[PDB]
Curated annotation (Swiss-Prot), chain C:
Molecular function via GO: ATP binding; ATP hydrolysis activity; ATP-dependent protein folding chaperone; unfolded protein binding
Subunit structure, interactors included: Heterooligomeric complex of about 850 to 900 kDa that forms two stacked rings, 12 to 16 nm in diameter. Interacts with PLP2; this interaction leads to inhibition of CCT complex mediated actin folding.
Keywords attached to this entry: Acetylation, ATP-binding, Chaperone, Cytoplasm, Nucleotide-binding
Species lineage: Eukaryota, Fungi, Dikarya, Ascomycota, Saccharomycotina
Cellular compartment(s): Cytoplasm
CDD domains (alphabetical): TCP1_beta (cd03336)
Protein's name in the database: T-complex protein 1 subunit beta
GO biological-process terms attached to the record: chaperone mediated protein folding independent of cofactor; protein folding
Family classification: Belongs to the TCP-1 chaperonin family.
Gene3D superfamilies: GroEL, GroEL-like equatorial domain, TCP-1-like chaperonin intermediate domain
Main location: cytoplasm
InterPro entries named in the record: Chap_CCT_beta, Chaperone_TCP-1, Chaperonin_TCP-1_CS, Cpn60/GroEL/TCP-1, GroEL-like_apical_dom_sf, GROEL-like_equatorial_sf, TCP-1-like_intermed_sf
Organism of origin: Saccharomyces cerevisiae (strain ATCC 204508 / S288c)
Gene Ontology CC entries for this record: chaperonin-containing T-complex; cytoplasm
Curated annotation (Swiss-Prot), chain D:
A Gene Ontology BP annotation from the UniProt entry: protein folding
Molecular-function annotations in GO: ATP binding; ATP hydrolysis activity; ATP-dependent protein folding chaperone; unfolded protein binding
Any one Gene Ontology cellular component term annotated for this protein: chaperonin-containing T-complex
PANTHER family associated with the record: CHAPERONIN
Lineage: Eukaryota, Fungi, Dikarya, Ascomycota, Saccharomycotina
Record protein name field: T-complex protein 1 subunit delta
Organism: Saccharomyces cerevisiae (strain ATCC 204508 / S288c)
Length: 502, 480, 504, 429
């Protein structure tokens, strides 16, 4: 435990004093001593120095993951992870708390830390009239070499409304893409009705009002799909069908749990036999088939459902709903257009091509076009820096530290101390007193004045909005996510296995 | 982290105090005995620090500071080391008071910028249009060299060479375009400017070589005349492609691999009167590509007419043991008219020290190009800064207020060393300078002792960033 | 090694009696050289005094613990255990700072004041059914009257002492009881008065009735300055110039007299006399001049009226003043008397004893102080508070309130004091065989905000309500340990360097 | 390391218990101890071993105080109480490795000791002091461990009749120090005189003038002294004088203490007897007189009859008797093992280890007797399931009083508690 905690601090001490523009520098010296150099880069110092500590090699792969996202903030990841391991010494002797319970306390603290930074985050998106107009011009530049360059106005307009109308996560998991044949690309339009290829039902109506959607995964029709190898021992042919008829009687136990929920719409990945489906007709239950994987997850996001396939207790679950389910037919194929989804946020771009070659090139080019538009949400958006954002996160941790059990009480409280260590180290390299600035900053933000921060030039507390010192919000989440994953493995280590040299 | 910095400051202070004894011509010379058995003796600070083979990592930074000191200002390589050690010596008590090095580092950069404006107000504003102060500056600077009576003749030659290439807004001028070619024979009184270009070697001494040609083209060619590695047929196509572009001057890069020009090719070039100059050093390859505006040509197919220069007259001047070839009228609008001065003398020890003497003479004149004006040396600019910082230190507040008092005290080390190396009492002479300071200011003018302002300015600027970078390293680890 | 001997050396000695706190605590053997004279005991004060300590810093802790034994004698071990936990938090504040601890000491005084106020609001008492306590108080007072000249009439004297205690509703110190004694009277004529009575009435033409009077304390001489003029060289052309110098010195006092009227007070108090000219100006400005204030009576007056005492003027319109509604001037026993009444929140009483000589007066006052001290001892006795870690945690959350408004360098000094208060349930849980991290964590979260009756239950090994189980601890023990541990920590911190004592 | 300091004392304490473990029972292994003064003594009695061992270990000396209280209260089991103490220390070694604080370990012994007494009283047969046939055979079996055998038949009613007079009812603690064993040279074992009034240690005046006998003596007829002329002065006044009174008997006579005072000498004794004190505050103190020829007779007889009075003392304070030989310790370990599931938490696991710690006493008895260690112990759990207290020691006349088995567990709970409660020790002077 000493090499994984104290031994990891010495690795973080090299990047500790090098954080910030006023930070110190380190020396990398070889045997000949004439090849040396002086630089503040944290990734260069760690990779150049050979590490005989087998526990220090874990932090090497952590810096490589951070460098993939963005080339800034690699130093702050090791420094923040070193403060969590430094306080881990007190988490053993005078605490005696299970390490995984301490990690679970960080997940509850990181959830409130990201929500606290979102409300205090600012952006340059103000005067959106100029901002929203430039979004369509950027998408037209990405249309070069792509078949979508034929019409810039109509094709880029669908990509513009596919971003701002989301009001949430910009990941492609909220956007549905459908590839169909027998049409032209100019007829494509934006529709939120969640259009998919397959239909459902035969004699059932195509319109459903006040629908209740529930997501589950089970096989209700002819389980054990492979019959090869079985041996049927029966006294008569009619006695062999008794096992199949006995299974139909047991189907009422699974149907009764569904009927008690009062849902007219069911989701199934596999098929359904006529008898359990005929019982759904009297109850007015329609089952949707061929939901794949994204169709299962994306349906729970727009309707507010759950992805669990089992029922742990009756009359307790997460249920969705939609106002109207409309089924139309276009291109000689039936389509499913949902309407009136509660709090539904998503978009579905239906690409209608004339062949298979135009569908694959349009989908791959749309992902690259939407990636630039979605990047503008995480880019140029900053937060108040200079100790501000570091202290604001400490207030959200203290809120969770109020109501807590006995095991995670010291774990959540220890995370709040590491958050104040970031402005403490930055104030050390600035040449001023860190204990005086961090202490006065907590008492000010405690009651009101959440925009205050630490001024490095004047060595006092000043308004960050007037000084104009801000730090990117994407950098804040990247460091917390990297520190949460790096500390999750290290705290669970009860023994060290030396890696084999290559 | 103090144990790492204090160990580097004490190690650097002993090196700075050792070089401090070498300040001035009367200073104490340091001896260095190499492992091979070679022993050098001189007062140059850059030579001592280069051959000392210092194993201390931070102490090796003084070599880079002394390199930039001679490259920019050209003087004060010893004084910049003394000022660097003076700030490190005063920083020993700063760490005992609990002062973080960031305030120490930020105060040196802020004091270095304010110290320049103080010197400019006390400096006498001069212009480059007046040749009276330009000749007297280079003439008095040569009093430290063997040349005495001949120093007055070389003074206007160095002035007219810089003023042509200085222009106005050019500011820094590359010193690599000025090539001093030393050769045995001749004398100092015989000099030729030859603004076109000057090579480092002679011409072909064999039979058949014209050695002189008028209206010829000069270009860089990396090819070489050699047999196949029948012979006259292979050499015929080589000279035939050169005749297509009418290139009468062939410059072959010196290489020990093969020869330069075959004896059979000399008879072919004698009819066309094509002059060839061999033994071109590798350092002159980049030099000839600038002033002449040509390009190095590796193969025979790369040889073109557009890459060839122009020469009005190429001849071999008759001189004892010299035979220097000159080129005039390069006629290149894109390339600037640089100056290459030929140094001649009977003894080998003459043309050697004469070349080094002209280096410091051109730097002092070049200091006036970047910033005009000059300040007399002898401790005058170092003490004058401390006079203004006495009352200014009271106007500050906080930790930085104490740094201004210690910064003026460290500047007194330079004038104190000048009094010690001259045998006079250290403190007694310094008190006599501050006593008359109430009336006189710059008064050294009657002794014809002049120093450029860039030397005093760069000495403070380089020493400010040096000491700043020393305190930045708090740890030393092994990395391989 | 100076602070290390006072910290690491004290913790090593402090941890010896730390595990012995409580009936379920650990035990320790004390072995001698011959080893046959040894003994086993749970007493913390015995282990510290018996073990020879060559550490000169540990010898001071022995002398500090002797104060608790002589003053009260209960909870001596708890004082050393609490004082040892204060050194553990102070050691972390120094090494991370290296600043003089006297600044941190000032933070403990501000935190200790908030801890005493939190225990007062939650304090209970056994004083209920005072009818049974009053009947026992009059019987005990008559027992003390034996062998004393006051034994002539027990009923009249014990009745005056009964109404002089239960009617206080506050501090029991004798400074709230004024003793007035006169000659040529009978002891049976003694009466009880709630006013503050002086003698030697002030002024001649001043009125005998004052409405809404204010009290100010100051020390100055306005009459006959320059007490000793002998030895100073006097160069004057005329004799009249000598008296002019004294008038110029008293002329500068007009600025201080003008500030008296700016205070909005109608009455001024001075110990010395006042010349006629500054006294005549007091009539036009409505200022009253009280004389013969002495010193004792000045301190007793400022406490009952809620005022302060100062001999100088720091700044006008800034001071802490008292008030009294009506001042009546009467005469009894052929001597002028003064009567102060109508004080805001005034709590006090005055017993006027009439003796036949000077010998009977001194014996009556000394016997009264010894009789009231025994009866007033029951005020701080038998009075308890809710225990079981509750009151220990209440003092912890009270310090966190002070952590809101605090200086930059004084935050860690005050916050560390709350951490030492939470070390008491940690030690008691380890000595009882329970998990300290599990119990204290759940104990602070519930008591954090509101409606928390929970406490430490050692029978079930969990957090339970102490009010239902009837677990209480004395309130006098709470103030005694905190006041002793606070002074014990100041002695060790105020010593920067500790010289090694001479080994015996 | 506060706990490691205590663990060093536990290992040193288990080494002392293992040394005494080999001395348990009459077939146990003797221990040779060489004193610093040069005296060489050897015996199987655990009380004499720990007394002359001169243990310098502070915690290990607690076994001496328990062995002293074991002989003062019960009078038997001084060897077995050391083994039972070391059994709880060995079981507590694995408890410290699990993170268990000794407070729970010490507090659980209080509930385990009180539960073991209630379980033992259920299988014990309650007896009364009114039956004189049981007390004769009880004290006669304790005399079978000594050379005297055929002459021990007359010694049984001597100890029984002495206690029954002072027993009365609800006497609780009965001090045996008031019963003095008089050792004189001459006589035989069969010759004994009770003399219920009192018996002195000294003879009378052999000079001239001494009356040596007086009727209605206390006007001082008889006096005691802790000159030859003083004897002649009091001879005319008819005052009997007895001098040279031992200082040890001064405190003895001040507790127990005449119608007739006479001097009766069987052979050579010249002893004075007193009868019929009839004091209201003072009770009827009886001093037993033992006669013998050789010195080894009255010596070995003194220690044999002293242990017989302790067995009777156990029956007076606590009624009932059980069969010895580790028979009840087997059933107690069986009941506590099944009842351990009724508890919850850390204390439930202590009941399982406490049952295994009680099986060391019957195991040692099988080891020191030459029988197979584990084989005999398995036969105990097998036979005790169907039968109750039937294994046969009743036919072999082996009877151990219940107070010895009760005090052995009670004193062991306090002895082990005082050990684990010491977390450190330092020089104190």
């Amino acid at each position: 435990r000493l090499s994984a905690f104290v031994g990891a601090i010495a690795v973080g001490d090299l990047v500790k004093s090098t954080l910030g523009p006023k930070g110190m520098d380190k020396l990398l010296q070889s045997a000949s001593s004439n090849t040396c150099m002086v630089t503040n880069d944290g990734a260069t110092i760690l990779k150049s120095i050979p590490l005989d500590n087998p526990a220090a090699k874990v932090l090497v792969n952590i810096s490589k993951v951070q460098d993939d996202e963005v080339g800034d903030g690699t130093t702050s990841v090791t420094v923040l992870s070193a403060e969590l391991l430094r306080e881990a010494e007190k988490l053993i002797d005078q605490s005696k708390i299970h390490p995984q319970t301490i990690i679970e306390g960080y997940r509850l603290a990181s959830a409130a830390a990201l929500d606290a930074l979102t409300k205090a985050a600012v952006d340059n998106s103000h005067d959106k009239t100029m901002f929203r107009e430039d979004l369509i011009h950027i998408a037209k530049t990405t249309l070069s070499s792509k078949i979508l360059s034929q019409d810039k106005d109509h094709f880029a307009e669908l990509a513009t409304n596919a971003i701002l109308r989301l009001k949430g996560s910009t990941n492609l998991e909220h956007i549905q893409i459908i590839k169909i044949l027998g049409g032209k690309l100019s007829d494509s339009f934006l529709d939120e009705g969640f259009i998919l290829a397959k239909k459902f039902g035969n004699n059932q109506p195509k319109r459903i009002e006040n629908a209740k959607i529930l997501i589950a995964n089970t096989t209700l029709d002819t389980d054990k799909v492979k019959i090869f190898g079985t041996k049927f021992k029966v006294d008569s042919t009619a006695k062999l069908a008794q096992l199949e008829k006995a299974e139909r009687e047991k189907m009422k136990n699974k149907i009764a749990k569904i009927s008690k929920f009062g849902i007219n719409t069911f989701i199934n990945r596999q098929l359904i036999y006529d008898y359990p489906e005929q019982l759904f007709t009297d109850l007015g239950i329609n089952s949707i088939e061929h939901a794949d994987f994204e169709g299962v997850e994306r349906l729970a996001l727009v309707t507010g459902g759950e992805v669990v396939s089992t029922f742990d207790e009756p009359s307790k679950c997460k249920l969705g709903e939609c106002d109207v389910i409309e089924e139309i037919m276009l291109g000689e194929q039936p389509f499913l257009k949902f309407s009136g989804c509660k709090a539904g946020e998503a978009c579905t771009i239906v690409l209608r091509g004339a062949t298979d070659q135009t569908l694959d090139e349009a989908e791959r080019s749309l992902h690259d076009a939407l990636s630039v538009l979605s990047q503008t949400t995480k880019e140029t958006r900053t937060v108040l820096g200079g100790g501000c954002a570091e202290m604001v996160m400490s207030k959200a941790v203290d809120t969770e530290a109020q109501n807590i059990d006995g095991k995670k009480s010291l774990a959540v409280e220890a995370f709040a101390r590491a958050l104040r260590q970031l402005p403490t180290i930055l104030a050390d390299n600035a040449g001023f007193d860190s204990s005086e600035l961090v202490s006065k900053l907590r008492s000010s933000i405690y009651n009101g004045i959440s925009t205050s921060g630490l001024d490095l030039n004047n060595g006092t507390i000043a308004d960050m909005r007037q000084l104009g010192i801000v730090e990117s919000y994407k950098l804040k989440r990247a460091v917390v996510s990297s520190a949460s994953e790096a500390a999750e493995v290290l705290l669970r280590v009860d023994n060290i296995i030396r890696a084999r040299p290559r | 982290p103090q144990e790492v910095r204090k160990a580097n400051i004490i190690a650097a202070r002993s090196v700075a105090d050792a070089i401090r004894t070498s300040l001035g011509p009367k200073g104490m010379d340091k001896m260095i005995k190499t492992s091979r058995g070679e022993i050098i003796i001189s007062n140059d600070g850059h030579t001592i620090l280069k051959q000392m083979a210092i194993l201390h990592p931070v102490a090796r930074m003084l070599v880079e500071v002394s390199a930039a000191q001679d490259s920019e200002a050209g003087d004060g390589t010893t004084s910049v080391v003394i000022l660097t050690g003076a700030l490190l010596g005063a920083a020993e008590r700063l760490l005992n008071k609990g002062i973080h090095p960031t305030i120490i580092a930020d105060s040196f950069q802020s004091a270095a910028k304010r110290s320049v404006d103080i010197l400019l107000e006390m400096c006498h504003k001069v212009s480059l249009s007046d040749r009276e102060q330009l000749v007297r500056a280079a003439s008095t600077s040569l009093s430290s060299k063997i040349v005495s009576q001949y120093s007055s003749f070389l003074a206007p030659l160095a002035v007219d060479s810089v003023l042509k290439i200085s222009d106005e807004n050019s500011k820094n001028v590359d010193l690599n375009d000025i090539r001093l070619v030393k050769k045995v024979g001749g004398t100092i009184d015989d000099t030729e400017m030859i603004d076109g270009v000057v090579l480092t070697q002679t011409a072909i001494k064999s039979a058949g070589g014209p050695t002189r040609k008028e209206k010829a083209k000069i270009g860089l060619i990396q090819f070489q005349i050699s047999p196949p590695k029948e012979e006259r047929a292979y050499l015929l196509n080589i000279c035939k492609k050169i005749k297509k572009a009418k290139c009468n001057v062939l410059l072959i890069q010196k290489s020990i691999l093969r020869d330069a020009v075959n004896d059979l090719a000399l008879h072919f070039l004698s009819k066309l009167n094509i002059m060839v100059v061999k033994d071109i050093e590798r350092e002159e390859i980049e030099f000839l590509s600038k002033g002449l505006g040509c390009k190095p040509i590796a193969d025979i197919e790369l040889f073109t007419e557009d890459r060839l220069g122009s020469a009005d007259l190429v001849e071999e001047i008759d001189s004892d043991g010299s035979k220097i070839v000159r080129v005039t009228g390069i006629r290149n609008n894109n390339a600037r008219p640089t100056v290459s001065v030929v140094i001649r003398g009977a003894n080998n020890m003459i043309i050697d020290e004469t070349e080094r003497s002209l280096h410091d003479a051109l730097c002092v004149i070049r200091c006036l190009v970047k910033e005009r004006g000059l300040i007399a040396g002898g401790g005058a600019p170092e003490i004058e800064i401390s006079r203004r910082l006495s009352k200014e230190a009271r106007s500050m507040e906080g930790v930085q207020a104490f740094i201004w008092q210690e910064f003026a005290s460290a500047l007194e080390v330079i004038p104190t060393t000048l009094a010690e190396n001259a045998g006079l009492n250290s403190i007694k002479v310094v008190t006599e300078l501050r006593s008359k300071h109430e009336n006189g200011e710059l008064n050294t003018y009657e002794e014809h002792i002049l120093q450029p302002v860039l030397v005093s300015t760069s000495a403070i600027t380089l020493a400010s960033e040096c000491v700043k970078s020393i305190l930045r390293i708090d740890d030393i680890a092994f990395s391989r």
